[PDB]
Write a protein that binds this ligand. Structure first.
Ligand code: HEM
Ligand code: HEM
Ligand code: HEM
Ligand code: HEM
Lengths: 146, 141, 141, 146
């Protein structure tokens, strides 16, 4: 939305370092463990009874990478987020009936994993900038709800 | 409501912070101001500049509270009574702000406690601050 | 914390609602659906069309809950034990929606009980709905 | 906002019937009354000790028509609430130190007051409309916070 170039670059830089395959998994996984009500949407996924049930779930694991990739693609069009997520936003509303708040839980969970993996490298301002990103992605995903 | 397990994790993690709570406390704050600048409105009388002595002084007090709340895990509402009164009657800090700071406190430990910051703990921890936040906001009305 | 005056106000207020409570419930749901289209992701199996029996019906259901909560203004947690069991463990409705149902309840009340909808009534009623949303989302975690 | 041509007239025409003086004073009056903490900013007004004491305060009523005025004015630039409110935005933050949150409260309170005033006329769809504006307005005031 309001990403200064230096925010834009700090974002992109780090994102270079991310292993979307595995970061997706931890984000979704962790989502499902931290806010267990979110489990309701993937009753289909089988065993989610435990943190290891969840974290390790190959199904959890694969969806996480799908999610994160959608996301990564969104990073490449920080200028037209609404538009980028247009078809997925309708899908989320018309088909999965996922309350849009769910999107800000994932956003925050995500910031934790970056924090987790990047440690010290994940500085306040970088946090600051990522914050705008997930803020913007969640808004993006909620644009077509009605 | 913290489970025994929840409790155990909180104790373990806070335990590891131990000694650095003040600097984490303070870092959480910087995290906050930088990521959610409206929160800044409540510290108009503060030097919020990088490595602010006001901010570090401030971060210490907040981790201190937490440490004491950790220590009174079975009697938070009472142990925190003092502080609940403050924020509800003097400060008049919107509850929303609370979920913002738990957020960053969560973010900071994550970057400091890699081996401890598991899903289980991340999960226990989220529940805790959620709990502390609850007490602090109890007397609003 | 409901003050005796609030409780009194509520009683007064809703006392007036009398036989149209269901109509109001009905009205307030319809009103939420329109203004906050996201509240709808929780009723995919309903006919959200104007004047639907599902909404009418549901309107009734909530109205009644409200009613029971008023006669039990003093022991809500107990009186609404089952509804909070349901919303926390079955329905699993995100807490912010309560804020929206509540607003909507008051919009409708005001539109219908002009003489009664005084600043202090308004206030009590905000507090009470607030009180009940707190009850409804307490077994959340 | 993302006001429908149709939605823009409903908003437009109801307002036309607004007793700016009256509506103005009651919304701010009800603000302070329903959400006491909001009075931490109008210490200066005097006796806000009681509902009748608040609703009665003329400094209150006065301040109310002043706010509604701005609102009124902003309804005429519904395509640019952002630019309309920038100066006022910087004021509430830089001078007043009002958390953007109270903006939201007022929004609601104005809705309640309008609901109060127009009864029947205040239709679901028309509530649906104003809601979107109180929304935009609130957001536009929050805009310049830092
Ligand atoms: C910004 C955050 C998110 C992004 C980018 C995202 C992206 C995606 C994508 C790309 C798909 C695949 C579309 C398809 O199957 O055609 C998907 C499916 C799905 N999403 Fe999301 N998602 C997000 C958040 C969420 C959240 C938080 C939830 C639940 C709390 C959720 C629930 C689902 C479900 C249940 C499916 C279908 C699973 C299945 O394949 O059966 N999404 N999402
Ligand atoms: C984890 C949640 C929080 C904890 C544990 C906490 C703890 C504390 C403590 C221990 C004090 C100092 C009391 C003294 O002087 O003895 C304090 C003061 C204060 N708190 Fe909080 N707080 C929390 C959340 C917040 C939030 C979210 C805000 C606003 C965004 C806030 C705003 C303030 C302010 C403005 C002061 C007074 C500072 C001064 O003027 O010295 N607090 N808090
Ligand atoms: C003021 C707070 C509320 C009260 C007093 C209330 C009351 C009730 C009542 C009495 C029922 C009927 C359960 C049954 O069928 O036995 C119910 C069910 C339900 N509630 Fe609530 N409710 C509140 C808030 C909400 C909100 C905010 C939402 C969603 C945004 C919601 C979603 C539902 C749903 C989806 C059902 C089940 C409907 C169906 O499947 O037939 N409730 N609630
Ligand atoms: C979008 C809604 C609002 C609008 C359009 C608005 C507009 C205004 C205007 C036009 C002034 C004039 C003061 C000056 O020019 O010096 C003002 C002052 C002020 N506003 Fe707002 N306001 C809004 C919401 C709020 C809220 C919700 C609060 C607090 C809860 C608030 C607190 C104040 C205060 C404390 C002043 C100072 C008045 C004075 O100078 O004596 N405002 N506002």
């Amino acid at each position: 939305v309001h990403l200064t170039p230096e925010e834009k670059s700090a974002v992109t830089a780090l994102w270079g370092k991310v292993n979307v395959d595995e970061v997706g998994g931890e984000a979704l996984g962790r989502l499902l463990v931290v806010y267990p009500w979110t489990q309701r949407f993937f009753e289909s996924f089988g065993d989610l009874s435990t943190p290891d049930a969840v974290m390790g779930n190959p199904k959890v694991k694969a969806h996480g990478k799908k999610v994160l990739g959608a996301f990564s693609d969104g990073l490449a069009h920080l200028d037209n987020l609404k538009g980028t997520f247009a078809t997925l936003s309708e899908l989320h509303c018309d088909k999965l009936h996922v309350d849009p708040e769910n999107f800000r839980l994932l956003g925050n969970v995500l910031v934790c994993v970056l924090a987790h993996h990047f440690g010290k490298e994940f500085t306040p301002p970088v946090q600051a900038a990522y914050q705008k990103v997930v803020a913007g992605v969640a808004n993006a995903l909620a644009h077509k709800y009605h | 409501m913290l489970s025994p397990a929840d409790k155990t994790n909180v104790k373990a993690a806070w335990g590891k912070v131990g000694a650095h709570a003040g600097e984490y406390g303070a870092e959480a704050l910087e995290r906050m101001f930088l990521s959610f600048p409206t929160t800044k409105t409540y510290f108009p009388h503060f030097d919020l500049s990088h490595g602010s002595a006001q901010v570090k002084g401030h971060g210490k007090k907040v981790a201190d509270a937490l440490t004491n709340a950790v220590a009174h895990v079975d009697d938070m509402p009472n142990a925190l009574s003092a502080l609940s009164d403050l924020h509800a009657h003097k400060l008049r800090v919107d509850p929303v702000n609370f979920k913002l700071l738990s957020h960053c406190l969560l973010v900071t430990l994550a970057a400091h406690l890699p081996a401890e910051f598991t899903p289980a703990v991340h999960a226990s921890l989220d529940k805790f601050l959620a709990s502390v936040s609850t007490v602090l906001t109890s007397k609003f009305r």
